Amino acid sequence: VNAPRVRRSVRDLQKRYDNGEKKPLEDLVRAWVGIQALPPSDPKSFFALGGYHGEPFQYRKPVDALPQDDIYPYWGGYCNHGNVLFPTWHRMYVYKLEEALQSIVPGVSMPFWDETDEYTLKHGIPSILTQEKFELDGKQIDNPLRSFVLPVALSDRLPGDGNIYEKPKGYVTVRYPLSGLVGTPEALEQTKIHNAKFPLPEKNTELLNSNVRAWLKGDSPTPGDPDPTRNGVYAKYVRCLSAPNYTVFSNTTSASVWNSSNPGLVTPVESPHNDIHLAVGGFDYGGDEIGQIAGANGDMGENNTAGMDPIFFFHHCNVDRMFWVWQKQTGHTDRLDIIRNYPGTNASDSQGPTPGFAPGESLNLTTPLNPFKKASGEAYTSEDCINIERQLGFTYGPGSLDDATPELKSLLAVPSGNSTKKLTVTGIDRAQIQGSFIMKAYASVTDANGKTREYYLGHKSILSRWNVVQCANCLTHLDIVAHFPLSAMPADDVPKAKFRVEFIHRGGGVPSAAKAAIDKVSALQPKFEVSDKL
Amino acid sequence: PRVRRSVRDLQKRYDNGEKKPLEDLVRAWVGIQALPPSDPKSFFALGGYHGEPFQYRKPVDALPQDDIYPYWGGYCNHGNVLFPTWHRMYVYKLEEALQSIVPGVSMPFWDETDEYTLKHGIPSILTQEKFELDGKQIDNPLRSFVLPVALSDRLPGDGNIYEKPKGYVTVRYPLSGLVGTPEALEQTKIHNAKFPLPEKNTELLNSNVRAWLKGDSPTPGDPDPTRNGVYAKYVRCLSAPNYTVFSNTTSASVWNSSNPGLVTPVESPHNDIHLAVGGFDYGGDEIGQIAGANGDMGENNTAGMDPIFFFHHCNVDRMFWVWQKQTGHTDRLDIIRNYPGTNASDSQGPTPGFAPGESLNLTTPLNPFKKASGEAYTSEDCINIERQLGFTYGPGSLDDATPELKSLLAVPSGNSTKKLTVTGIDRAQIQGSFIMKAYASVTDANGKTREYYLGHKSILSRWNVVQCANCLTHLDIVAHFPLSAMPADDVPKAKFRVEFIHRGGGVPSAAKAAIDKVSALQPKFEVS
Ligand SMILES: [Cu+2]
Ligand SMILES: [Cu+2]
Ligand SMILES: [Cu+2]
Ligand SMILES: [Cu+2]
Ligand SMILES: [O]
Ligand SMILES: [O]
């Protein structure tokens, strides 16, 4: 009805400030200072809001206690992942934090970190999100956006017990290349050793910016034009805008099954999203190695405490913008549909049921997006946030990838004579894993002379969670199934290829769980299968 | 019939030229500490049997606060009639491992009540840093033990106060060894920085051990054990009327609520020594409520990992043998059926393989100890140590009842023969061992006031890791104290009080709540 508020690019707000129009950036900072200073029992404090995502958890004590053959994974946070509520839940999450910012500074808008604009590709994260200080009211302050100090502890307050979920009062959030897993003596010990290697704030920010550029590129970042390859996060965000329906656009579970039953490759918005979390939250895009431990256990790297890092919301505002662009480019600004009973539409899927959900329960456009409530006191659903302009009163200003162009079509195109086929990787066995991990796929072909060529087929980011489990035997058993284009390779070379996957993982984040990560990830033989041509 | 001797005796003999006894003892201890953790004669396995590493009952651990009950994941029996005979077997079984290394070797006893200990504390051979074996300097294996593997539940993502890393060294008063959470380790680091010198620490410990034995601050001349010290309590225990109440604190407590006078079970002074070596200052209630020196011996969790546990328990067995001799129970023991102390639910709760409500008797198996035939040992197998186990106790303190020992426990002419019962401390939460000290003040109409110390009670207990806020063990505290220190006409004027020394929840985040509860307690006082 009324003209939408305009969510704008954070980079654009910083440029306006750089040139003397400071009010916009100052309002945003002032709002963030205000929500960070509200008491933690207030539903609009940053601590409460960040706490909605993951920890502090609610538990299912009778489930935690089940034996190995009976137990099933569940999520003690409210956030929806690996399921069709991913986009809409996070839409409301961002909106709800924005309602909180507005309680400090009326009519302020939550901007977006435009992750795929020219600035980010060439320089990484805008410095307003990383810098130490800000000038507000002619006083220097700590930048509330670089990190957040916990006002109370994340703790289950169980007598005698400490675990890797737990984080003390005064804990400050960290990003790559630092670690902040501290709830057991060994985690804390490993964190202190790891962080001793990275003592200089300015160098740390350079490393982070450079990691973000490499992830976006899909290779080590070149000076000049940025040149995104077809494997990077840039390409993956472009791909997601072509996902053919909301179900497979929405989440990794739906997309995986779609990719096993349809020709070609769809990419859910959740995928490139996952990448940004891992880059910012402690995974080096890295390279060609057999395997690697990501010891930077940053808050953004797992779902447990990512919501306590302010950058979570700048990122997720960009993910919401991509969701809105997909709605516009595909005709879904006013309606969504979900394939009934498709993988991704069950509470049991992926992370498992959120508080108050039961195993087997169906997720649909009617499902409560807990804990978000309308003025009525009634639970928001997906049906309430399809159209951000008509139902929520805001829109997205201009930014990268608004428009389907020819330049973008071709970046996704199979070069002529290169393979149109896809690789399916299944090491369906084990999956007894602690924290997030990356799968990187390679093909090597040895010609007649004995000269080996390596083809990099791409990455897959599994954004997961830290786990505390009551039996030494069963953590949470999972199908490894991953698809990769073979478009990096000449079509006729596919039959001569020897495939491998490099896992990059947390390896427990500890020294008592790094002897079943060198020798149990190395005693896992993936199966590889190659489809028909298109 | 092999003889077990005073270790002070073996040490005198060493300093006078005769070294093979002490050298054989040390060699055997080096031997069993060097065996691998998976060998059931390794010291790690043997110390493991007592307490941690635990076997759990996960369905019980998940019970709600109204349904949960305490149980013990170690094999040791405590607060029940198998306390004396289970520990008898336990020491015997560690002697067998020592014999694995050095055939025919005998496990001595720390004679806690000899003249040396009253005046100088622990024999230095148990505290010395170093020892001469085969004209080489080795680390003294009796001083402490280094864990060859972690005490760990090996639960991914979890760490609790039960857990101690590989390379952990055992510690005594005045040091703390609770390290399984970041909080406990940090407090341990801060507490231990207050006690940085090993020589001073050894002095502090010897002085606390003397003060416990005496029952007041140690005097520099002759020892002068009061009626309230651990000396007196060991003496009182040799008069226990029957095995049932000799054997454990649950039986003796109900006996003392139901009969005139006071009995002392051998488990009681035994608890005293644990807390003395394991972190409690006898004088601690002049300073504060919290005993921060969380040493292995001070709780049942890891006490068995500290070598001195076996020298002490060798003396506890001695006292049980002596009680047997002096009361003619060398060959037969009796259990009052269904008396408190005869149930697996009593005190620490059931050991592995026992069920709530299950009876305990002389046929009950003393797990995990098994004969050459693979059959489980029972209390029937170990009543006469000479006849069935093949060893005796050499001479040492207290083995004869005498006029001097009778006049120590006896009420000064004109003093009260009555007794004080302290209760009204219903449903307290247990985290670690604690001590009660009772006092009386009397004020005349003219306004003069005298102060009386009535004595102490040591509750040897455990660390507890729970799955809910209010899911700790609950305990009714009941404690009985003699009134012998008071003149009889002051008793009706008296105002009684108790002081507690406790662990404060084990960690700083649990301390203020613990202190508030204890300070709030309004105990009831009852005079017989
Ligand atoms: Cu999320
Ligand atoms: Cu996210
Ligand atoms: Cu014991
Ligand atoms: Cu003991
Ligand atoms: O997320
Ligand atoms: O004990």
XYZ file of N, CA and C in Angstrom, chain A residues 61-62 64-67 157-165 182-186 188 192 434 467-472 475 512, chain B residues 58-59 62 152-163 179-182 185-186 189 431 464-469 472 505:
186
model
N 15.919 -34.068 26.080
C 16.674 -34.917 26.994
C 16.371 -36.394 26.722
N 15.084 -36.745 26.467
C 14.835 -38.165 26.245
C 15.440 -38.631 24.914
N 18.297 -37.263 23.572
C 19.771 -37.296 23.774
C 20.236 -38.593 24.378
N 19.347 -39.192 25.176
C 19.656 -40.388 25.950
C 19.396 -41.678 25.169
N 18.782 -41.610 23.990
C 18.474 -42.841 23.211
C 19.757 -43.602 22.810
N 19.667 -44.945 22.665
C 20.776 -45.709 22.117
C 20.995 -45.399 20.635
N 24.591 -24.609 32.406
C 24.605 -24.518 33.879
C 24.359 -25.921 34.454
N 24.990 -26.940 33.890
C 24.904 -28.284 34.438
C 26.071 -28.505 35.396
N 25.777 -28.872 36.654
C 26.833 -29.074 37.653
C 27.827 -30.148 37.184
N 29.106 -29.774 37.162
C 30.182 -30.697 36.859
C 30.551 -30.731 35.387
N 29.733 -30.113 34.510
C 29.857 -30.334 33.085
C 30.238 -29.084 32.321
N 31.139 -29.232 31.339
C 31.441 -28.179 30.345
C 31.399 -28.749 28.933
N 30.959 -28.003 27.912
C 31.027 -28.615 26.577
C 31.268 -27.532 25.516
N 31.409 -27.952 24.257
C 31.914 -27.056 23.233
C 30.793 -26.119 22.778
N 29.554 -26.386 23.197
C 28.514 -25.383 23.011
C 28.807 -24.127 23.834
N 35.798 -22.810 22.869
C 36.480 -22.618 24.169
C 35.815 -23.401 25.328
N 34.824 -24.255 25.080
C 34.006 -24.758 26.174
C 34.568 -25.998 26.852
N 35.571 -26.641 26.267
C 36.313 -27.672 26.943
C 37.783 -27.251 27.057
N 38.512 -27.903 27.970
C 39.933 -27.529 28.170
C 40.732 -27.706 26.874
N 40.503 -28.790 26.154
C 41.258 -29.053 24.936
C 40.833 -28.045 23.855
N 39.793 -25.053 24.198
C 40.354 -23.773 24.616
C 41.868 -23.756 24.371
N 43.961 -21.340 21.774
C 45.015 -20.391 22.205
C 46.286 -20.561 21.351
N 31.955 -33.823 13.235
C 31.936 -32.717 14.144
C 32.125 -31.434 13.314
N 28.563 -30.711 17.695
C 27.733 -31.689 18.411
C 28.362 -32.149 19.722
N 27.514 -32.218 20.732
C 27.817 -32.873 22.009
C 26.922 -34.104 22.128
N 27.515 -35.271 22.178
C 26.749 -36.508 22.092
C 27.072 -37.418 23.284
N 26.030 -38.095 23.784
C 26.111 -38.889 25.012
C 26.619 -40.325 24.780
N 26.761 -40.836 23.559
C 27.346 -42.190 23.354
C 28.575 -42.075 22.436
N 29.662 -42.807 22.722
C 30.922 -42.708 21.920
C 30.729 -43.294 20.509
N 27.316 -40.478 16.548
C 27.191 -39.023 16.516
C 25.887 -38.644 15.783
N 42.084 -34.614 20.863
C 41.567 -35.932 21.267
C 40.650 -36.504 20.172
N 22.825 -44.762 31.950
C 22.379 -43.612 31.196
C 20.869 -43.408 31.391
N 20.119 -44.501 31.600
C 18.685 -44.285 31.762
C 18.396 -43.595 33.107
N 19.338 -39.771 33.008
C 18.271 -38.945 32.373
C 17.020 -38.788 33.256
N 38.865 -40.371 30.691
C 37.956 -39.707 29.796
C 36.751 -40.595 29.493
N 35.587 -39.967 29.463
C 34.394 -40.609 28.974
C 34.423 -40.699 27.434
N 35.374 -40.043 26.767
C 35.448 -40.070 25.306
C 34.075 -39.709 24.689
N 33.362 -38.766 25.276
C 32.196 -38.217 24.637
C 32.618 -36.996 23.802
N 32.380 -37.073 22.470
C 32.592 -35.944 21.528
C 31.921 -34.650 22.019
N 32.723 -33.593 22.108
C 32.220 -32.246 22.436
C 32.086 -31.973 23.931
N 32.238 -32.993 24.781
C 31.971 -32.853 26.220
C 33.239 -32.982 27.053
N 33.265 -32.276 28.166
C 34.318 -32.388 29.167
C 33.728 -32.117 30.539
N 33.972 -32.968 31.500
C 33.349 -32.757 32.800
C 34.431 -32.879 33.882
N 34.077 -32.624 35.142
C 35.094 -32.656 36.244
C 35.600 -34.071 36.562
N 34.953 -35.121 36.036
C 35.490 -36.468 36.182
C 36.788 -36.619 35.384
N 36.961 -35.830 34.327
C 37.960 -36.154 33.323
C 39.291 -35.480 33.658
N 40.372 -30.593 36.905
C 40.844 -29.932 35.717
C 39.959 -30.213 34.492
N 38.813 -30.836 34.642
C 38.110 -31.383 33.461
C 37.242 -30.350 32.752
N 36.914 -29.215 33.392
C 36.319 -28.090 32.718
C 37.250 -26.876 32.718
N 36.956 -25.916 31.832
C 37.854 -24.768 31.673
C 37.880 -23.940 32.967
N 39.790 -25.966 35.744
C 41.219 -25.920 35.474
C 41.740 -24.525 35.825
N 40.987 -23.481 35.479
C 41.446 -22.132 35.726
C 41.535 -21.914 37.237
N 44.434 -23.595 38.587
C 45.691 -22.944 38.270
C 45.945 -21.790 39.252
N 28.094 -31.868 46.427
C 29.168 -31.730 45.480
C 30.499 -31.783 46.252
N 30.197 -35.010 41.308
C 29.002 -35.453 40.631
C 28.753 -34.579 39.402
N 28.540 -35.230 38.278
C 28.231 -34.542 37.007
C 26.769 -34.814 36.653
N 25.907 -33.816 36.658
C 24.485 -34.164 36.469
C 23.934 -33.558 35.179
N 22.798 -34.111 34.745
C 22.043 -33.716 33.548
C 20.905 -32.733 33.878
N 20.810 -32.139 35.072
C 19.807 -31.072 35.268
C 20.245 -30.164 36.424
N 19.611 -28.996 36.544
C 19.905 -28.003 37.595
C 19.878 -28.652 38.984
N 21.442 -33.095 41.454
C 22.444 -33.633 42.416
C 21.743 -34.536 43.453
N 30.789 -26.258 45.379
C 30.306 -26.641 44.055
C 31.421 -27.082 43.110
